[PDB]
C-alpha cells in the first residue's frame, strides 16, 4: 500500500499516500502533509 502521514520513511524510496497529498521529505525523512 502507502505510508500514512507523518509517517517515517525514505526519500530515496518514498512510498506515501499520494493520494492523500503525502511525500516523503528528505530532511524531514517523514511523509508531510503538502497543500
Known sequence: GCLGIFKACNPSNDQCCKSSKLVCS????????QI
Do not use: Q
Request: aromatic content about 24%; glycine content about 0%; some cysteine.
Open 26 to 33: 528528505r530532511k524531514t525523512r517523514w511523509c508531510k502533509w
